[PDB]
Design a protein around this ligand. Structure first.
Ligand SMILES: C=C(C)CCOP(=O)(O)OP(=O)(O)O
Ligand SMILES: C=C(C)CCOP(=O)(O)OP(=O)(O)O
Ligand SMILES: C=C(C)CCOP(=O)(O)OP(=O)(O)O
Ligand SMILES: C=C(C)CCOP(=O)(O)OP(=O)(O)O
Ligand SMILES: [Mg+2]
Ligand SMILES: [Mg+2]
Ligand SMILES: [Mg+2]
Ligand SMILES: [Mg+2]
Ligand SMILES: [Mg+2]
Ligand SMILES: [Mg+2]
Lengths: 288, 290
């Protein structure tokens, strides 16, 4: 239902204006339709719902904007000059399906279009401006793209945990923290609560990358939908490479536990029903 | 008042230096392309329209101008890439990917796109104004604007198409981000719908004209003049104005387009509190002779 509606919202954005380049629209939609867990938009919508706010088309637009930036980031991450994968979401990567130019531009479209999507909501305009500012912050030079540069620069280097945390909190952490913070902001919560939601999001965001690192070296192709073990060949700074699998599994499980405990704590202090968020977090757990 | 070019660049610099650095290499790559050069026509036109409308310039106007220049800059970085136009030179210097590497250039362009909206949301404009500016800048830049035009441009390589299809490419890849500063300044000025449409119209005329001009320069001017490799359009079999219509008719179209834009601007000056002399002088600097 949420899943279906998120994809409807994205399809609507691309199919309700007069088309300029049919090939561009097709390339953008290819990557969207290839698959994806939709964790980021789902979390935004679940927090709104948990905070007792009926979901509207505007919430789905805000959620879609977040997913659009996430999708653009994947398309560029996969490119030959970056991680160079032939597969994403169980299908050919955008650049192998089409060509590199098309993939570069499809990613660019998603980044630029995302802010138009976000600006189409019926939220109060002060809310919208804050969401735009924060989404830029999470995504750009001081967020995801900054993290991506650090990830590429760390290849083959012996970095420490602080530096590994810096990569992971930025390349992945920021865009998983944003949906928690953004939902709280739309709910117009006070500063203390906005900080607690950002904290939960930052814990989930770092844990998600620890999880992604573990899966890179433990899972098969069918399970992850991308070529396994690229992190090893590329000499990426990762949790397993720095700390080992045993510690990485412990950190993932502890982090997920902590996020859940903070969520349950909130429900003692405000009108907040986190059961769906808790269910989603449970589905992220791994077994060695 | 202040030199606009220097203030625009200082505004962009401050955006990158006012927050704790995450990747120094990224900041360096972004600023390299900004600092390489550029006429800054897009942000200058926005600022000139604000001033022509008798509005004193503020930090916020420079931020909005800077955001536009950031998107424009990101578009050049990606346009130069090996998978796209494959130029080794831009703004008289090595292109971003030849100075650094392909990955760096991809990410530098991505940064500029994503950062631009953060820049725009830093203004002190009324929030309803900012939301409209964000929506419109996305429209001008994305799948229905610049990027859409970029895809059409690559798809038309080696293809014979008509004027209609050539205009579709040009209006979207270049027209929209030259139309935006006119529309956006009128929007910040809070002009009525009719005036917003008139300013957009002026900008679309100037925007289409600027690409005709660019097409003409790519085949008539040398490397020293344009700061990029001449004649790339020819070798890659791009659809251009001189190819579709000949050089003579292309010069004629440029001149008459710039005439048309100037006429609308003069008419507005006879109707509202608007003083476009500096805009008109900028437009005159865009003229070419055979
Ligand atoms: C680890 C990161 C940040 C990239 C993959 O994210 P996901 O694992 O959420 O990818 P999809 O489900 O969207 O394919
Ligand atoms: C912005 C991104 C893609 C962060 C996750 O990095 P990875 O390169 O490990 O993600 P996957 O390709 O493994 O999904
Ligand atoms: C839209 C086009 C023709 C790309 C180059 O734009 P400019 O000719 O304005 O480039 P800079 O001055 O910014 O270098
Ligand atoms: C979005 C852009 C960059 C439009 C100009 O494309 P061109 O490829 O014609 O411009 P130059 O490289 O000649 O500046
Ligand atoms: Mg990567
Ligand atoms: Mg990757
Ligand atoms: Mg990975
Ligand atoms: Mg080009
Ligand atoms: Mg080019
Ligand atoms: Mg050109």
């Amino acid at each position: 239902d949420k899943l279906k509606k998120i994809d409807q919202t994205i399809h609507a954005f691309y199919c309700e204006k007069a088309v300029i380049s049919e090939k561009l629209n097709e390339a953008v939609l290819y990557s969207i339709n290839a698959g994806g867990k939709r964790i980021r938009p789902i979390l935004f919508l679940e927090v709104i719902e948990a905070l007792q706010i009926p979901l509207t088309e505007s919430h789905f637009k805000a959620a879609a904007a977040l997913e659009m930036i996430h999708t653009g980031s994947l398309i560029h991450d996969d490119l030959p000059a970056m991680d160079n994968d032939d597969y994403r979401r169980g299908q050919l990567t955008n650049h192998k399906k089409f060509d590199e130019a098309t993939a570069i531009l499809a990613g660019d479209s998603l980044f630029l279009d995302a802010f138009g999507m976000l600006a189409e909501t019926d939220f109060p305009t002060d809310v919208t401006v804050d969401l735009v500012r924060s989404l830029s912050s999470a995504s750009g030079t001081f967020g995801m793209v900054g993290g991506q540069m650090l990830d590429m620069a760390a290849e083959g280097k012996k970095l420490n945990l602080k530096n590994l945390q810096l990569i992971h909190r930025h390349k992945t952490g920021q865009l998983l923290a944003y949906p928690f913070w953004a939902a709280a902001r739309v709910a117009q919560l006070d500063e203390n609560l906005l900080a607690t939601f950002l904290e939960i999001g930052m814990i989930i965001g770092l844990a998600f990358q620890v999880r992604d690192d573990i899966l890179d070296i433990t899972a098969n192709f069918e399970e992850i939908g991308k070529t396994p073990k690229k992190d090893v060949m590329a000499e990426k700074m990762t949790y397993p490479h720095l700390l080992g699998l045993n510690e990485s599994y412990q950190i993932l499980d502890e982090s997920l536990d902590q996020a859940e405990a903070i969520l349950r704590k909130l429900s003692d202090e405000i009108a907040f029903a986190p059961q769906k968020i808790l269910s989603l977090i449970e589905r992220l757990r791994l077994d060695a």
